[PDB]
Amino acid sequence: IVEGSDAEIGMSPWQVMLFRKSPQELLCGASLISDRWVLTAAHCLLYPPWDKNFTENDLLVRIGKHSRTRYERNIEKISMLEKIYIHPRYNWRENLDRDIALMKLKKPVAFSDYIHPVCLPDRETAASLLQAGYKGRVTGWGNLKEKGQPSVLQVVNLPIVERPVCKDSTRIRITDNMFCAGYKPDEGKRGDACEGDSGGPFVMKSPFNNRWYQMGIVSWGEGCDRDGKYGFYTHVFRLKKWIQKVIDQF
């Protein structure tokens, strides 16, 4: 996260760290949506252009974390993956359209003050909150820019951007399954996700019921916190039918 700040303890209890077994390192962010299901970006697990194609046994999920590198004894919980489900129409060949994946844990994780699931939006909540100007929150242990790594989980609030502006900021083909967020050059304020934040959640707190909803998944960007550029996020509600289908079937 670029231009963000240290998260407070228990501020994002649904935050999940996708951890590579060997070599041990941060692979991506993810989110907890139930005691046995974790949501992330498909490109975190599958991206042929970069020879990336992880299998269940290649990674681990670390939940309840705050510190990036330390083993948080008595706080974080580490889970093994039972199965990975990538959207069948995920477009890794071109623009990362439908960049979404689910991971089922081998055993249910116990909720605590530091581990708790985020809500997935309904049609109404999505329609009401997914508006240009409305701000969401992005969290992660990714790069602080094109420098080093953070000691603890970082957080940044960013405004959703008008679709025409998103489209005119890049040469990549944007689809309805994506939305972009970030400040404009004239707004002064800054902030963006960066390497390592991919797969993490873009959440919004509903002013109707005071619950946090995951509206997006950190998907892609060109550079980090560059003026005139914006981060792109997977539109979770638009792909909810697939999410429900997978969970109902498996």
Partner: peptide, 27 residues
Amino acid sequence: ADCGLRPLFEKKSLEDKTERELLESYI
């Protein structure tokens, strides 16, 4: 169910340092 309600915040009626920024943007 109980999703989206944080044990250390919503559950005990405590607000985090910047959630108000989000609320103020929902005009």
